[PDB]
């Protein structure tokens, strides 16, 4: 079994703007969300090959990860926040279709989207 590779995390010819929005998801939004007691499952790629779940990219056809939107933010490949925004909503919905309601693996997801909305509020 194999793995897809990654989401995009760098191309030359898309065009890039620093904004205090996107300073705001890196400094606060990704920083917090990372040091969360549940974060780890979420700071990387789903690894199907190691976690046996063969089906995982069958299902999900647009891959999030915090591990990406780091890298996105930190090599910033963004317009505008709300392309940032989106990639956090498509890693927790991905985690509720994949999974069942109630299970652990969403109940995780549910505190760390809990947080970002949270801090969402005060986006500048
Ligand atoms: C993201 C995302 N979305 N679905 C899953 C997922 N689903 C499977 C079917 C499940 N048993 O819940 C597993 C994991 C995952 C990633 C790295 C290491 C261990 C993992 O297993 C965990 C399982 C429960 C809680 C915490 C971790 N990550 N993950």
């Given at each position: 079994?194999?793995?897809?590779?990654?989401?995009?995390?760098?191309?030359?010819?898309?065009?890039?703007?620093?904004?205090?929005?996107?300073?705001?998801?890196?400094?606060?939004?990704?920083?917090?969300?990372?040091?969360?007691?549940?974060?780890?499952?979420?700071?990387?790629?789903?690894?199907?090959?190691?976690?046996?779940?063969?089906?995982?990219?069958?299902?999900?056809?647009?891959?999030?990860?915090?591990?990406?939107?780091?890298?996105?933010?930190?090599?910033?490949?963004?317009?505008?926040?709300?392309?940032?925004?989106?990639?956090?909503?498509?890693?927790?919905?991905?985690?509720?279709?994949?999974?069942?309601?109630?299970?652990?693996?969403?109940?995780?997801?549910?505190?760390?989207?809990?947080?970002?909305?949270?801090?969402?509020?005060?986006?500048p």
């Amino acid at each position: 079994s194999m793995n897809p590779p990654p989401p995009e995390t760098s191309n030359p010819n898309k065009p890039k703007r620093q904004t205090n929005q996107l300073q705001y998801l890196l400094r606060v939004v990704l920083k917090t969300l990372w040091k969360h007691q549940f974060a780890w499952p979420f700071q990387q790629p789903v690894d199907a090959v190691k976690l046996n779940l063969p089906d995982y990219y069958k299902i999900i056809k647009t891959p999030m990860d915090m591990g990406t939107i780091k890298k996105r933010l930190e090599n910033n490949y963004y317009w505008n926040a709300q392309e940032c925004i989106q990639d956090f909503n498509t890693m927790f919905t991905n985690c509720y279709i994949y999974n069942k309601p109630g299970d652990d693996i969403v109940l995780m997801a549910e505190a760390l989207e809990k947080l970002f909305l949270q801090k969402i509020n005060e986006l500048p």
